[PDB]
Structure 1
Amino acid sequence: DLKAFSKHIYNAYLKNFNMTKKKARSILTAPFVIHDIETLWQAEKGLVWKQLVNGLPPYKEISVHVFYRCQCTTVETVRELTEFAKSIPSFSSLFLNDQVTLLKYGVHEAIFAMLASIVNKDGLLVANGSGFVTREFLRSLRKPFSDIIEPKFEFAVKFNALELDDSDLALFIAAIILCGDRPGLMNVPRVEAIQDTILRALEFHLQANHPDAQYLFPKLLQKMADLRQLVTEHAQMMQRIKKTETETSLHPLLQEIYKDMY
């Protein structure tokens, strides 16, 4: 039951996410360092990116260009999360409208949790591990673009202190997506039931994987609550950008995610 449950989730996680925390940590211990405008330019000229630069919206400025690259990665991680979720039998058993509801309100929490895997206190990996953008450079962007980034590093460094591996994260992320609290859900009892099974699997798994860790399971439950507050603040900053940065393009999928959030 729960052992094979977890194992199926773990394989779904390995199957659908290109960058795993294992791969990321090895690199973070070399990548081209982006820390100013010149190295950013060189990086765009020199590094392979998943989305091609001319494919981005028309250029406006440096801070906005960075934002577009963040937005590109966000949308790509949504696609991965969707296929990850669909690789879970109980998720695909849900009516398609409930699937969309869970992803809509779940993906950003899952993204910011997984983000910690490619983050340290000095910056984060970009371009599939080919580059490393410094936290200080991201801090130097003009508001509101620098403001929307720093809160994630703060969460990330604290989160990495728990020292989860990929197998723990697969269950953690599954639990975030299969959440019975999401607005507009049709079959709440069914999602609550799946959520409960995942959380049992998570505890079972952590007992085995981290036998000497103390209070880790309730600590992770608190991280789930923390991520909700993080995403609320994020959505508020995105609404601010929408209203005060009219020249900045917003990806339509992300726009569909944000119109009913406060």
Structure 2
Amino acid sequence: HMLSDEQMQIINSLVEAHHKTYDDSYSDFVRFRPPVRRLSMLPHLADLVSYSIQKVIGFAKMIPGFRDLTAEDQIALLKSSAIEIIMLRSNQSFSLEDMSWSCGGPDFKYCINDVTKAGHTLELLEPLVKFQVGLKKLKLHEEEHVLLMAICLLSPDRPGVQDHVRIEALQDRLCDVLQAYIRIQHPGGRLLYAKMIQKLADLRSLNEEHSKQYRSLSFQPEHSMQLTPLVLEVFGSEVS
């Protein structure tokens, strides 16, 4: 009927980690290669995603217990989940009115047609937009949003992880926090936790479709040369 001190301490750490790694002013975006509307948007979106990967790494390093995993597991979790965390965290810029991601500037407003000009198809972008709208409609508290990103990150059912038992125990404790938070602090949230776990399933499906379409980019050197080294590393197929 009430959250414990340890549960609250987890929430505080995760909220702080998100506020430290998500800059609502979007002022760093002027440093990316500019948007162009031949894959005219691939340079700008590559830079955006590369920047976002660095933020997700910074967020992950502040999740309780992530830092204490082996280096191989930390890499395994980030390589499998990075694209999902980016899709999740981008909801904070998504607008139901514009049906687009809005980042404090008309040049940094991204609609579906922009992403087609980076090598992706409606087979990815239609479920992605439907995901954003459904997730936005849940009206998650920031507490619930950061818990979901952490739960998504600390999934043991990802390729390459060795210490399944350790990661599952971390993810278990985060799920307990989220269920308790919704019950005590989220008025009328009886069906919310189930909906949030459904979104984790949706992300798996978006992850697969993105990986398939990213293989086409990475197999064509005139396109892969537009990516960043960090993107090449994290979305690449190297195994530690």
- TM-score, normalising length: structure 1: 0.77
Of all paired residues, the percent bearing the same amino acid is: 25
Asked if 1:17 is matched to 2:22, the reply is yes
**TM superposition shift of 1:73:** 1.2
Are the counterparts in 1 of residues 65 and 170 from structure 2 also a CA contact under 8 Å? yes
Asked if 1:222 is matched to 2:202, the reply is no
1:162-181 → structure 2 map (5 Å cutoff):
162-181=138-157
Are the counterparts in 2 of residues 179 and 192 from structure 1 also a CA contact under 8 Å? yes
58, 73, 82: which one aligns with 1:98: 73
Q: Secondary structure at the match of 1:64?
A: coil
| Alpha-carbon distance between aligned partners in 1 of 2:55 and 2:157, rounded to the nearest angstrom | 22
Structure 1: gaps spanning 5 or more residues = 25-46
Partner residue in 2 for 1:43: none
**TM superposition shift of 1:151:** 3.5
- Matched residue type, 1:3: M
Are the counterparts in 1 of residues 155 and 171 from structure 2 also a CA contact under 8 Å? yes
- Matched residue type, 1:18: D
Asked if 1:4 is matched to 2:9, the reply is yes
| Alpha-carbon distance between aligned partners in 1 of 2:101 and 2:38, rounded to the nearest angstrom | 17
Q: Which is further off, 148-157 or 5-14?
A: 148-157
Q: Secondary structure at the match of 2:83?
A: helix
- Matched residue type, 2:59: F
Change in Cα spacing, 1:67 to 1:14, as seen in structure 2 (3 Å) is same
148, 154, 158: which one aligns with 2:134: 158
Structure 2: gaps spanning 5 or more residues = 1-5
CA deviations on 1:193-214 (whole Å, 9 max, x unpaired) are: 0000011111111223312123
| Alpha-carbon distance between aligned partners in 1 of 2:114 and 2:73, rounded to the nearest angstrom | 36
**TM superposition shift of 1:112:** 0.5
| Alpha-carbon distance between aligned partners in 2 of 1:78 and 1:175, rounded to the nearest angstrom | 17
Are the counterparts in 1 of residues 42 and 118 from structure 2 also a CA contact under 8 Å? no
Q: Secondary structure at the match of 1:49?
A: helix
Change in Cα spacing, 1:48 to 1:178, as seen in structure 2 (3 Å) is closer
Are the counterparts in 2 of residues 98 and 186 from structure 1 also a CA contact under 8 Å? yes
CA deviations on 1:66-107 (whole Å, 9 max, x unpaired) are: 222111111111111111111123111111221111111111
Give the superposed CA RMSD: 2.7
| Alpha-carbon distance between aligned partners in 1 of 2:31 and 2:110, rounded to the nearest angstrom | 21
| Alpha-carbon distance between aligned partners in 2 of 1:97 and 1:48, rounded to the nearest angstrom | 30
**TM superposition shift of 1:239:** 1.2
